[PDB]
Copies of this chain bind each other. A is one copy, B any other.
Amino acid sequence: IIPVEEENPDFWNREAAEALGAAKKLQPAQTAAKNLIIFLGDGMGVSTVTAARILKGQKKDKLGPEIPLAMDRFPYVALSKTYNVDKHVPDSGATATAYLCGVKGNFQTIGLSAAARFNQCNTTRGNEVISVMNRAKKAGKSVGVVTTTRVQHASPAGTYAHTVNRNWYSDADVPASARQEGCQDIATQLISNMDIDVILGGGRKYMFRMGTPDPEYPDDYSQGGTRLDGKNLVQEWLAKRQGARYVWNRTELMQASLDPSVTHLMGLFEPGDMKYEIHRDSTLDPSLMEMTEAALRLLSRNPRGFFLFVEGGRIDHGHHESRAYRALTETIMFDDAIERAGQLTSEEDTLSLVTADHSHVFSFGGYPLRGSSIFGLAPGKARDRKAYTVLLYGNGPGYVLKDGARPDVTESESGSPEYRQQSAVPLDEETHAGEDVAVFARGPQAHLVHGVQEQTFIAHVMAFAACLEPYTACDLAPPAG
């Protein structure tokens, strides 16, 4: 459909004039950032962003592509080069090292330089690289990790852990030789490496000994504790801190986030990853946006500021399943969380970066009409006289041959939350993609986010803006009020 108002050149001329005016108004801060927020859309490449924009636009009864996402309103944009040292198409572990520690590493390692080797515990020591979040804590800031994945997953783990193997969630995952050599599982590192004021997400199971019933699924043993060392990491964590509270559900999170006496908060809301937003139990589980607000309630209390990590962690997972409906609905909730954080913090003193660790082989094509569903069919048949979808994958589990040929697709089918878009190559999981991702930035020193940068730049600009090591001689004035 053609919006009548857009037929008039004046519409476009007025908008562009408005855009130029806004562009001219942009000025760099002379002051430091009190607070640092990184919003990480795991797997949220450029094609995910645009597709999510269209979906969200239509959610609010608009045509789609013309409505800005919250992230679209960020003034400063750069392209981020995501390659790991050893692989062109990266993983979450080694990209975390780049955007959180400012050093590139090798595929599937976390918080380690590329002198380390994956799954070789004895290459660990001397290669630990300290995250910006760790450095923010050392400077007396409060720090928060918020994600819809396990809190021990690769991305959040980049804020606190150093490991040659991202799969080492609990001691149960670490080979005897590595345990003997002192390589700690990530759940242990979560509670031991550094003080973290707010930890919100999934990953209950790795914190408790085998046999421990999950409090929310006490009748499903696969959801229970995983530990073989007899440790209760939650109790150990609680015992280390006065003001500390552990919650496993939304109601308790709410109570804690408003409780003046709660100084340390660990909320682990599922045994593993949190449910997709479309499957979330809104009585039992906080959304990413709600966890973000909960984190902000506690973190904002520290006069010295905070570092907050917020991950749209299951965007990635949606794409891996080649279920764009899940990828994009996670992306919109991620954008809602970004919007909410913006309402609760001031760009006068808060440097906010939105980025992705890497992209996916997700594409948005065909020649669909303005206002058509992103989950719809491309107008016109493919060369095999069957329909195809506007959303497709290069590879992944949507590759199907029914009776020797590519199956036809209907709108009802293509529009289902369970639908897997077709791909060129069958894989159990769709792969990451290696192309540049966006960095969006707002707040003090955000203007430094520019051009085409190595992914490591994200960590460095944040450390610089807050005058953290190695930029304590930042030469910036104190954060603005």
Contacts and interface: CB of A to CB of B under 8 A. Distances in A.
Interface of A: 1-3, 6-9, 12-13, 15-17, 19-20, 23-24, 26, 45-47, 49-51, 54, 64-66, 68, 72-79, 81, 83-89, 91, 98, 102-104, 106-107, 113-115, 129, 359-370, 372, 378, 382-384, 388, 390, 392-395, 397-399, 401, 404-406, 421-428, 430-436, 438, 440, 447-454, 456-457, 459-461, 464, 470-471
B422 A425 contact: yes
B114 A2 contact: yes
Contacts of A449: 23
Given A2-B114, A20-B461, A433 B365 contact: yes
B87 A427 contact: no
Task: Tell me the number of copies of this protein.
Answer: 2
Given A51-B435, A452-B77, A85 B370 contact: yes
Contact of A103 (B9, B364, B370): B9
Contact of A454 (B16, B78, B426, B427): B16
Contact of A13 (B84, B102, B451): B102
30 contacts: A7-B114, A7-B115, A8-B115, A9-B129, A13-B470, A15-B454, A16-B456, A20-B464, A20-B471, A26-B447, A64-B88, A66-B454, A72-B451, A74-B452, A76-B451, A79-B438, A87-B369, A89-B366, A91-B367, A363-B393, A366-B395, A367-B432, A382-B426, A383-B426, A384-B426, A388-B425, A393-B424, A401-B405, A422-B425, A424-B424
Contacts of A114: 2, 6-7
Given A15-B456, A425-B382, A370 B78 contact: no
For A24, A50, A394, A471, the residue with the greatest tally of chain B CB atoms inside 10 Å of its CB is: A394
A77 B78 contact: yes
A392 B361 contact: yes
B87 A19 contact: no
A394 B464 CA distance: 41
Contacts of A382: 395, 425-427
